Amino acid sequence: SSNAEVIKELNKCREENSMRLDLSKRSIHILPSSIKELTQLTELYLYSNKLQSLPAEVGCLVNLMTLALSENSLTSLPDSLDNLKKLRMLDLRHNKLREIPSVVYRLDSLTTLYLRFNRITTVEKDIKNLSKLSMLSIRENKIKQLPAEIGELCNLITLDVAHNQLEHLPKEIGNCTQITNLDLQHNELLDLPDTIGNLSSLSRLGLRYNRLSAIPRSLAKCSALEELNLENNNISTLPESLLSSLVKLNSLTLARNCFQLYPVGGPSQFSTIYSLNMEHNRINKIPFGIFSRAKVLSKLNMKDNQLTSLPLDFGTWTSMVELNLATNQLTKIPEDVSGLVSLEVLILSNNLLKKLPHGLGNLRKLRELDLEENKLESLPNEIAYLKDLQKLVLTNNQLTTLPRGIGHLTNLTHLGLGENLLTHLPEEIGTLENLEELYLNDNPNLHSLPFELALCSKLSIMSIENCPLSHLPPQIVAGGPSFIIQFLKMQGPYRAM
Ligand SMILES: O=C(O)[C@H](Nc1ccc2oc(=O)[nH]c2c1)c1ccccc1OCc1cc(-c2ccccc2)ccc1Cl
Ligand SMILES: [K+]
């Protein structure tokens, strides 16, 4: 879009006395200084261009309330922007700012400042000039520190400093008591100030990927917390009762820390959680009763801990929907697994299991069952009742066949049986109305597919690589699933259908 098109547009604007001018998405290199005429502008959009500088004449637009500048190549702003004494909203994200332009520290009208994705290293003390700020975003820059004068921003509601190099917060941040979203993910925080309990309106606190080894006891005063994410730190305990005081917590991530037990406290801690993620710790026990009150707990992740067993009451988790216990040392699943009537996903991959409880058959809503990497020598006959099951992964167990009841799994689409000890499959494989994918690779002893495999008319993926299949003619099985399945339709007794 050419210099003369830009000037045509500015004349249309100044003539219609329009109060908004959108010059965005036009690969402009230089904004003409004729824009000084358009003093009746209250919004000017320049985002997504090739600007490497803002003309000074933009400072004449003394009624601007929005200056949208993202996705350009600005490395500074001109000092004349001082005249924008009503500018409430300034967007500079995705530029090449080596710092915040000093003029910006003088726009004390601003209530919204976006600086995501730049190369800023310092936030100057002058930041206290912008006390009307209610939203401040500097995520994806290179800020090593925040000044104490940030406690002067007594109207922040959203403070986003994710993906920087902060190692501390200044205790004065606790003067910002209107804050409700604080994102500190991907920094190098070693600790949090104790003033943090001042933030009694804080509802989303993101500390994932930091160097924290303790949570301040005062965080139990952030009674409005709804989501707390501490994923990947060096935390090994929390101050007692902490979770009990967070009377609205919906989701909690403690994953990838140093915990060996659950946080201490009663069911009061999880009375209100809906999602609880603790993968990648060393927790050796789910305490009896911690979920006795979690009436809306529906996603629990305990993957890769030190579980050797499940609690007596674990079938009381009647509203749970996703349960991941992969990569523990479980040697059996209790029979009260039948109480989990809401379960739709069960991940037990890479434990120590040889058989499954009879009670597994009662999860009438289970859609995905992951059992890879176990020691399974057979499946129970009661899986015939997993009426909703659609994905069943059994790779690298030691099954020799499958229950005849397998054929009742109407809804089953993915049947992963690779790396087993299968000798044959039951004829009732044929009533698998919806089987699309059937993995059978690496079964050194599978010597025949049944002819009723041809009645799976949605079957479009079958791997049999490295299976003798010596009961079928060698040259058929030499031509792969193409020819094996053809052979099973036409030379079996269903070629009529
Ligand atoms: O995906 C992201 O990096 C972020 N969404 C998020 C998801 C999980 C996180 O655990 C962390 O430790 N930080 C996280 C960020 C995103 C995505 C799209 C648009 C804005 C985003 O971020 C804004 C934001 C989020 C929070 C927050 C804090 C705790 C839990 C959930 C959200 C607070 C302030 C702001 Cl401004
Ligand atoms: K860690």
Its sign, for the CA torsion 57, 66, 172, 190, is negative
Q: Separation of 150 CA from ligand 1 center, angstroms? A: 21
**Identity (one letter) of the amino acid at 191?**
D
Q: Separation of 167 CA from ligand 2 center, angstroms? A: 16
**Identity (one letter) of the amino acid at 215?**
I
Phi, psi dihedrals of residue 41, rounded to the nearest 5°: -70, 130
Q: Which segments of 246-350 does DSSP mark as H helices, in order? A: none
The DSSP call for residue 472 is S
Tell me the C-alpha distance between 18 and 395, whole Å: 66
Q: Separation of 182 CA from ligand 1 center, angstroms? A: 8
Ligand nearest to the CA of 280: 2
Residue nearest (by alpha carbon) to ligand 1 atom 16: 183
Give the ligand 1 atom nearest the CA of 231.
12
Tell me the three-class secondary structure of 227-275, residue by residue. EEECCCCCCCCCCCCHHHHCCCCCEEECCCCCCCCCCCCCHHHCCCCCE
CB 261 within 8 A of CB 285: yes
Residue nearest (by alpha carbon) to ligand 1 atom 10: 206
- What lines the ligand 1 site, CB under 6 Å? 158, 160, 181-183, 185, 204-208, 227, 229
Contacts 24+ apart (CB under 8 A), 2-9: 3/30, 3/32, 6/31, 6/32, 7/32, 7/34
CB 464 within 8 A of CB 438: no
Q: Where do the domains of the chain lie, and which CATH numbers do they carry?
A: 1-120 (3.80.10.10)
Q: Separation of 349 CA from ligand 2 center, angstroms? A: 23
Q: Separation of 33 CA from ligand 1 center, angstroms? A: 40
Compute CA distances 7 → 34, 137, 315, 405, whole Å: 8, 33, 72, 76
State the CB neighbour count (10 A cutoff) for residue 259.
Answer: 20
End-to-end CA distance of the chain: 64
Q: Separation of 465 CA from ligand 2 center, angstroms? A: 40
Phi, psi dihedrals of residue 198, rounded to the nearest 5°: -60, -35
Q: Separation of 240 CA from ligand 1 center, angstroms? A: 26
Tell me the C-alpha distance between 139 and 160, whole Å: 6
CB 9 within 8 A of CB 23: yes
Residue nearest (by alpha carbon) to ligand 1 atom 26: 183
Residue nearest (by alpha carbon) to ligand 1 atom 7: 206
| Residue 483 host element (H or E) | helix 480-490
Give the ligand 1 atom nearest the CA of 159.
36
Resolution to one decimal, Å: 2.7
Reduced to 3 states (helix: H, G, I; strand: E, B; else coil), residue 137 is strand
Give the ligand 1 atom nearest the CA of 185.
12
Ligand nearest to the CA of 137: 1
Number of H helices, E strands in the chain: 4, 20
Residue nearest (by alpha carbon) to ligand 1 atom 25: 183
Residue nearest (by alpha carbon) to ligand 1 atom 9: 206
Instruction: Spell out the residues 6+ positions from residue 4 whose beta carbon is closer than 8 angstroms to its own.
Output: none
Ligand nearest to the CA of 212: 2
Give the mutation target among 173, 183, 187, 201 for probing the ligand 1 site: most ligand atoms within 8 A of CB.
Answer: 183
Phi, psi dihedrals of residue 170, rounded to the nearest 5°: -70, 135
The DSSP call for residue 409 is -
Give the ligand 1 atom nearest the CA of 207.
12
Q: Separation of 156 CA from ligand 1 center, angstroms? A: 16
CB 106 within 8 A of CB 84: no
Q: Separation of 54 CA from ligand 2 center, angstroms? A: 44
Its sign, for the CA torsion 264, 267, 273, 279, is positive
Dihedral over alpha carbons 260, 266, 269, 270 (to 10 degrees)? 90
Ligand nearest to the CA of 282: 2
Give the ligand 1 atom nearest the CA of 227.
30
Q: Separation of 445 CA from ligand 2 center, angstroms? A: 43
Instruction: Spell out the residues 6+ positions from residue 83 whose beta carbon is closer than 8 angstroms to its own.
Output: 59, 60, 62
Ligand nearest to the CA of 230: 1
Residue nearest (by alpha carbon) to ligand 1 atom 13: 206
Tell me the C-alpha distance between 252 and 274, whole Å: 9
Give the ligand 1 atom nearest the CA of 251.
30
Ligand nearest to the CA of 249: 1
Q: Separation of 87 CA from ligand 1 center, angstroms? A: 27
Tell me the C-alpha distance between 209 and 280, whole Å: 14
